[PDB]
Amino acid sequence: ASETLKTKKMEVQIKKNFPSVLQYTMTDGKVMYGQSKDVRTVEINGTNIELGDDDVTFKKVSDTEATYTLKVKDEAKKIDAVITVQITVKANQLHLNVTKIKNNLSEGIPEGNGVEENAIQTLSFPNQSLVSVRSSQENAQFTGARMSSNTQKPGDTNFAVTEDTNVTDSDYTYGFISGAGLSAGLWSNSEHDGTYVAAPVRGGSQNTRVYATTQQTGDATSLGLASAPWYYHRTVTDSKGKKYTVAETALPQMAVAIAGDENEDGAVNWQDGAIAYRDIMNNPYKSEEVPELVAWRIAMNFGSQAQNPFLTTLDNVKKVALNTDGLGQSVLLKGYGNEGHDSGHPDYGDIGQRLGGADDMNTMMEEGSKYGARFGVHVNASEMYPEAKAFSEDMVRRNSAGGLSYGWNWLDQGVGIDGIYDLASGSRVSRFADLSKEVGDNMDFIYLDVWGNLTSSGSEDSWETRKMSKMINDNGWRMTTEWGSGNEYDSTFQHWAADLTYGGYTSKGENSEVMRFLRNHQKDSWVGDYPQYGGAANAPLLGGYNMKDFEGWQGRNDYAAYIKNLYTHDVSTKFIQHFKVTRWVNNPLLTADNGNAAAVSDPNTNNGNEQITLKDSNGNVVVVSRGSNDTSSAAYRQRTITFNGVKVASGVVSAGDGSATGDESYLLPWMWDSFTGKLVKDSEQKLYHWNTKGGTTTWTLPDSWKNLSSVKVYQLTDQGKTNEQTVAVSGGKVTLTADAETPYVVYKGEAKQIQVNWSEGMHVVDAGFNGGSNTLTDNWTVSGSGKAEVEGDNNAMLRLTGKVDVSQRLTDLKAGQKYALYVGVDNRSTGDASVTVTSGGKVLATNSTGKSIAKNYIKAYGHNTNSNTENGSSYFQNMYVFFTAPENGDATVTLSHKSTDGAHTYFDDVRIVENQYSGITYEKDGTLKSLTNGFENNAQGIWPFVVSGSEGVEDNRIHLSELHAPFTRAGWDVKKMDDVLDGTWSVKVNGLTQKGTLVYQTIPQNVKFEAGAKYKVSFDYQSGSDDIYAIAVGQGEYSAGSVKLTNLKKALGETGKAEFELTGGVNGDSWFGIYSTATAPDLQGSTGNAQDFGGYKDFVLDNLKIERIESQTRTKAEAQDKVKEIRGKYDSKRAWQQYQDTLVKARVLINKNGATAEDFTKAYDILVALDEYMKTAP
Ligand SMILES: [Mn+2]
Ligand SMILES: [Mn+2]
Ligand SMILES: [Mn+2]
Ligand SMILES: [Mn+2]
């Protein structure tokens, strides 16, 4: 016997003896079958149990709901369960939910996720056939999807269901059946992993949730769909062999939705079922905001450098907002935590103190949201460093031998995290809670790096990935991840899908027509244009996110290229995501040969060439059409886009792989706000215009613009809307002239400038010189005979020439508190460039640099030596002052150039930060008396040192190491060096042996050594081997063979001491530093990772002390005699520039009117140093 459940759209006949459907009858009389045969199988823990009449009780709750109680028992196999099942119907949907599972053999999971004996681990209903179609029905067919990251291998299958179709639990991510005028897909929350087409990783790539099985049904073959098995209480083992039972992510759920000809195209196939399927499918959390995310990019910090503090990222948000006229953004903070990128894993709650900590991060996010910018952070749940407070013996993944599972060595040695322990112990969820306490509700997303690559365990399956995504989504965070194929269920972005350059054609986003038809609008997880990959990547009609960056990720810093790329691919891609696919025909990727014979070829659509139709909930219609399906035709890459029948884009996109400029032009109506994406005031609707080659094009305006007599057009730049033009509208059409690759925005009437207050929270207005030439009148005050300009078409800078002062009042200081102020400076002049903080005309603090001597090698930094500040190079380095905020609240910063030279000084990034450093002591006249540094208060970087060129422009393997005993100390595992010598922080060099060049160095702007003055330098150190690192002393820009070197002896696990004296060079440009020799390390018979983790190749420095010392006082005569002695030694040589230079300068000190004993002593000491130099001169 049976009962009927009923909605306005259908009646469903259900069996009383099992949660089975006999058939669905739609209002119009069309019928779809369920399970026409007596099948009553329940699987628990892999055992099939067939239920009899007495094993099932039934109750019809209402016309929309029935409840079943299933006794599921097999004594032999230790199964004794009672399963409650609910069937409900609404509209054209039927839901089947397991609402209760009672285990008669268990009291549940023991405390701390102990093993539950006889746990019900898996449950399914084999061959349940919730919906079915038959070989006897008209146009009976199946379409299924599996995961493919390979642009040349489609994930889909499309075939007719015939009497020969034979299939048993054939598994698919998605599965649709159609026949006799109806179509249905089956949805399930099953975490089952199964068959895939192509995927480089696990991590949820393999989730297959639908099982297709044929059975004989009278004289016909019936293809039925069932859910793949669900996990309930799964028992798992960690890397140490410890077992746990972990409760279900969610109770079992599944559903079907019955469609007729939903897109009204006269055929019934999976596309009709897919439209209905959107009403029942899981939707990734916060997938509704994806179409607003026009401007993705990464802002990077690394190696303690603070390349991108949070308030700077906010300013770059405002710059992008101006240049895009306020389109939404999604900024991925790679290195938001601890010392930067790939430091501090997995302490999710440790927000980078050198970046401004949680406070600046929150200010950035809160203010950024007003410009439609979302923020998210890069985390790692697979690898960790000793420095992280979460690092523990239980967190460590061990191999079967009991040794560490080592990760990557770079700044420090990474160690695998035991992924099963991290889940089952509650450790990972607790660290995400730490992060939640810091960010509250402000942060948009998590970016989970690497998950799926088997670094945390050999599984990382869909079950683990589902739990991972849930702990993230539970904190209000949208899920995003690295690998193109990963996390089909929950992820809304894959870095290796959106950045098309990575991985190659086998390793991209999801190459499936079914998946993209269903979810294009919900994810940036697809294949975009990158034609060298072929197939899916040759001009996809839907486009696809193409991600570039300008804030340091992999050295990327080209802002203009970033913006051009947004307009080339991303604006149209995002426009398209505002609509949902309703029809897709003539797909050239699908053939009879690749398992897709039943895909539609409609010769009456677009000449039988590919076309996709999309609609929104207001009935707007977008149609995207391929010029030709033949890849050797010029027309294969031609795309037309229409909006409500009107052409809004036409042509060939510049190749997404950078290889060939295109000719596409567009006039796209951007009808939505950058927030929840609602329609904007009819009066603030706008169109974006782009013309790849440049030139003149004519367009039909949207219907609501058709009666206007003119429009207003603005050219968009980094300053916002410029060059307003009034363009006549004639018969609803406009003609537009555009420079090539230049963005314009079109309004119905006059439009106001997006308001921007540069550098909120930064104590100064426009700290990064983003406000155009106007900033030097509106924000900064310029004075003097020289010249101040905002210079650079990329990351703009202050450029000074001649005698000029540029100043600005400081705001929002806490009176009586200590601050560092540092500014990037590159001085090409021989004259000094200075930074000064004054209060009431009185100097609080001041510092200066002569000609810069050290090029910038910091890859993630915006003015490194690959960025061309001037000539082939950049010498940008941070120049500091330290002051106490005055009680009267009156403080001013001045940036200046003194000399009347024609050469330039560059400044950028004025940073005022609370800072407790107080290790500099001056002499009466303001020269250096002493500088000490335990590195406990570094605002950023390895100050007073700067990183040198031993790795070129790199994410340099030098940073501030952090204490976390015992793991960071000698003696843990195979570690033989302490990371930290004193306090919590030291300067660490990792593995930079045999470079035969300078590793880092002081510079004059950081530590100035006065000409002829004498200084004692000392520090504590550890060094992994004898003579692998040396003290270097030099004057001016480093050059091979013009430095004094002193080899350092091994101090491995016990701290050594170094001290030496130096005499200031005559040009004030002396410096000392650490140098990597040509000597090989002694690895003490260590092999494998031990060679790196042992510390044999490393150098740690702490407790630096620099102090002026008393020199033996000299008379003028002694100095004069020393000149004679030196000239007697070397004037007869010549077998010399340095010599003559030092000599002239020494004689100046000697002969000056009013010279004193200090002058004579300096002259004498200068000549003694000249003597030592000259002994080993070229
Ligand atoms: Mn249809
Ligand atoms: Mn700048
Ligand atoms: Mn220290
Ligand atoms: Mn470290």
Distance CA 1167, CA 1159 (A): 12
How many alpha carbons fall within 13 Å on the CB side of residue 1091? 12
Contacts of 675 (CB under 8 A, 6+ apart): 292, 328, 372
Is 306 found in the same domain as 393?
yes
Taking a C-beta distance cutoff of 8 angstroms, is the pair 396, 416 a contact?
yes
Pairing of strands 413-416, 93-103: unpaired
Is 274 found in the same domain as 412?
no
Distance CA 112, CA 423 (A): 11
Q: How far is the CA of 962 from the centre of ligand 4 (A)?
A: 6
DSSP 3-state of 134:
strand
Token output for 1019: 């520090």
User: Hey, what's the torsion of the CAs at 1057, 1063, 1066, 1068, to 10 degrees?
Assistant: 40
Is 288 found in the same domain as 277?
no
Is 288 found in the same domain as 271?
no
What burial class does residue 753 get, using C-beta atoms within 10 Å of its C-beta: 0-12 exposed, 13-18 middle, 19+ buried?
exposed
Count the Cβ atoms, other than its own, within 10 Å of residue 691: 23
Residues 722, 728, 734: CA angle, nearest 5 degrees: 90
Instruction: Give the distance from CA 334 to its chain's centroid.
Output: 5
Taking a C-beta distance cutoff of 8 angstroms, is the pair 978, 1053 a contact?
yes
Ligand number nearest CA of 139 is: 1
Last residue of a domain, one of 721, 737, 755: 755
Element (H, E) at 271: helix 270-277
DSSP 3-state of 1143:
helix
Contacts of 61 (CB under 8 A, 6+ apart): 67
Long-range contacts of 11-15 (CB under 8 A, 24+ apart): 12/89, 12/94, 14/66, 14/87
Taking a C-beta distance cutoff of 8 angstroms, is the pair 237, 147 a contact?
no
Among 198, 492, 268, 237, residue whose Cα is nearest residue 374: 492
Beta bridge partners of 66: 60, 87
**Cα–Cα separations (whole angstroms), residue 805 to 782, 788, 837:** 6, 8, 12
Is 689 found in the same domain as 806?
no
Distance CA 813, CA 896 (A): 22
Q: How far is the CA of 270 from the centre of ligand 1 (A)?
A: 8
Is 874 found in the same domain as 852?
yes
- CA dihedral sign of residues 1126, 1128, 1130, 1134: positive
Is 761 found in the same domain as 817?
yes
Token output for 1176: 């080993």
Q: How far is the CA of 1104 from the centre of ligand 3 (A)?
A: 9
DSSP 3-state of 1137:
helix
Q: How far is the CA of 260 from the centre of ligand 1 (A)?
A: 7
Query: Could you say which DSSP state residue 567 is in?
Result: I
Please indicate if the annotation marks 741 as binding a ligand.
no
Token output for 44: 């628990």
Distance CA 1021, CA 1101 (A): 4
Taking a C-beta distance cutoff of 8 angstroms, is the pair 205, 171 a contact?
no
Distance CA 366, CA 317 (A): 12
Q: How far is the CA of 406 from the centre of ligand 3 (A)?
A: 27
For this entry, resolution in Å reads: 2.0
Helix locations, 26-89, DSSP H: none
Is 249 found in the same domain as 318?
no
1145 dihedral zone (left: phi>0; alpha: psi -120 to 50; beta): alpha
Taking a C-beta distance cutoff of 8 angstroms, is the pair 1005, 849 a contact?
yes
Is 629 found in the same domain as 724?
yes
Taking a C-beta distance cutoff of 8 angstroms, is the pair 249, 556 a contact?
no
Q: How far is the CA of 509 from the centre of ligand 4 (A)?
A: 33
DSSP 3-state of 525:
coil
Please indicate if the annotation marks 444 as binding a ligand.
no
Taking a C-beta distance cutoff of 8 angstroms, is the pair 896, 834 a contact?
yes
Distance CA 114, CA 106 (A): 13
- Catalytic annotation, pick one of 171, 315, 449, 979: 449
Experimental method: X-ray
Residue 605 is part of a domain; what is its CATH number?
2.60.40.1180
Among 220, 114, 228, residue whose Cα is nearest residue 169: 228
Among 332, 290, 550, 552, residue whose Cα is nearest residue 443: 332
- Catalytic annotation, pick one of 171, 262, 325, 482: 482
Is 367 considered catalytic here?
no
Please indicate if the annotation marks 1102 as binding a ligand.
yes
Taking a C-beta distance cutoff of 8 angstroms, is the pair 479, 473 a contact?
yes
Pairing of strands 220-227, 230-231: unpaired
The label of the residue with tokens 């002390």 reads 1105
Among 384, 379, 366, 243, residue whose Cα is nearest residue 314: 366
Long-range contacts of 1089-1094 (CB under 8 A, 24+ apart): 1089/404, 1089/406, 1089/409, 1089/413, 1089/974, 1090/974, 1092/409, 1092/413, 1092/990, 1092/991, 1093/406, 1093/409, 1093/413, 1093/973, 1093/974, 1093/975, 1094/974, 1094/975, 1094/976, 1094/977, 1094/1024
Please indicate if the annotation marks 699 as binding a ligand.
no
Taking a C-beta distance cutoff of 8 angstroms, is the pair 189, 229 a contact?
no
Instruction: Give the distance from CA 567 to its chain's centroid.
Output: 20
Is 803 found in the same domain as 708?
no
**Cα–Cα separations (whole angstroms), residue 1108 to 260, 473, 928, 1026, 1044:** 89, 58, 7, 29, 20
Pairing of strands 373-379, 445-448: parallel
Amino acid at 53: D
Is 482 considered catalytic here?
yes
- What are the start-end ranges of the E strands in 335-437? 373-379, 383-384, 406-409, 413-416
**Cα–Cα separations (whole angstroms), residue 629 to 152, 543, 587, 664:** 15, 16, 8, 18
Ligand number nearest CA of 876 is: 2
Distance CA 1110, CA 278 (A): 82
- CA dihedral sign of residues 1173, 1174, 1176, 1178: positive
Taking a C-beta distance cutoff of 8 angstroms, is the pair 417, 453 a contact?
no
DSSP 3-state of 114:
coil
Ligand number nearest CA of 270 is: 1
Last residue of a domain, one of 703, 735, 755: 755
Please indicate if the annotation marks 982 as binding a ligand.
yes
Taking a C-beta distance cutoff of 8 angstroms, is the pair 716, 751 a contact?
no
Among 979, 805, 971, 827, residue whose Cα is nearest residue 893: 805
Residue 1042 is part of a domain; what is its CATH number?
2.60.120.260
Distance CA 310, CA 378 (A): 14
How many alpha carbons fall within 13 Å on the CB side of residue 643? 23
Distance CA 826, CA 674 (A): 38
Using only C-alpha atoms, the chain has a radius of gyration, in whole angstroms, of 35
Angle between helices 310-324 and 357-369 (to 10 degrees): 10
Contacts of 1092 (CB under 8 A, 6+ apart): 409, 413, 990, 991
Contacts of 1097 (CB under 8 A, 6+ apart): 990, 991, 992, 993, 1024, 1025, 1028, 1081, 1091
Ligand number nearest CA of 337 is: 4
Token output for 432: 């995400």
Distance CA 879, CA 822 (A): 5
Q: Is the omega angle on the peptide bond into residue 346 within 30 degrees of 0, that is, cis?
A: yes
Surrounding ion ligand 2 within 5 Å at CB are 768-769, 795-796, 908
Q: What are the backbone angles phi and psi of residue 1049, rounded to the nearest 5°?
A: -80, 155
Contacts of 820 (CB under 8 A, 6+ apart): 880, 881, 882, 911, 912, 913, 915, 917, 939
Q: How far is the CA of 943 from the centre of ligand 3 (A)?
A: 13
Contacts of 748 (CB under 8 A, 6+ apart): 683, 685, 705, 708, 711, 712
Amino acid at 803: K
Token output for 299: 């802002």
The label of the residue with tokens 């000056």 reads 1152
Ligand number nearest CA of 960 is: 4
Token output for 1073: 């530093």
Element (H, E) at 228: none
Q: What is the DSSP string of 1057-1072?
A: EEEEEEEB-TTS-EEE
Distance CA 581, CA 823 (A): 51
- First CA to last CA across the chain, in angstroms? 105
Q: How many residues does the chain have?
A: 1178
What burial class does residue 1131 get, using C-beta atoms within 10 Å of its C-beta: 0-12 exposed, 13-18 middle, 19+ buried?
exposed
How many alpha carbons fall within 13 Å on the CB side of residue 254? 30
Taking a C-beta distance cutoff of 8 angstroms, is the pair 600, 583 a contact?
no
Last residue of a domain, one of 242, 267, 283: 283
Is 384 found in the same domain as 368?
yes
Count the Cβ atoms, other than its own, within 10 Å of residue 814: 10
- What are the start-end ranges of the E strands in 1096-1136? 1099-1108
Is 294 found in the same domain as 229?
no
Q: Give how many domains the chain has, as a whole number.
A: 6
Amino acid at 231: Y
Question: For every residue of 616-665, which 3-state class applies, written as one string?
Answer: CCCCCEEEEEECCCCCCCHHHHCEEEEECCEEEEEECCCCCCCCCCCCCE
Contacts of 707 (CB under 8 A, 6+ apart): 732
Distance CA 266, CA 269 (A): 10
Among 279, 225, 163, 277, residue whose Cα is nearest residue 33: 225
**Cα–Cα separations (whole angstroms), residue 43 to 79, 229, 230, 1133:** 10, 8, 10, 97
Domain that holds residue 3: 1-283
Please indicate if the annotation marks 359 as binding a ligand.
no
Please indicate if the annotation marks 934 as binding a ligand.
yes
DSSP 3-state of 1168:
helix
Please indicate if the annotation marks 315 as binding a ligand.
no
Distance CA 769, CA 774 (A): 10
Among 333, 293, 863, residue whose Cα is nearest residue 559: 863
Distance CA 641, CA 530 (A): 20
Count the Cβ atoms, other than its own, within 10 Å of residue 906: 24
Element (H, E) at 160: strand 156-160
Element (H, E) at 1075: strand 1070-1076
Contacts of 999 (CB under 8 A, 6+ apart): 947, 948, 950, 958, 989, 992, 1029, 1073, 1074, 1075, 1076, 1099
Distance CA 955, CA 548 (A): 19
Q: How far is the CA of 860 from the centre of ligand 2 (A)?
A: 14
DSSP 3-state of 431:
helix
Instruction: Encode burial over 199-218: b for 16+ CB neighbours within 10 A, e otherwise.
Output: bbbbbbbbbbbbbbbbbebe
Count the Cβ atoms, other than its own, within 10 Å of residue 1080: 12
Taking a C-beta distance cutoff of 8 angstroms, is the pair 51, 126 a contact?
no
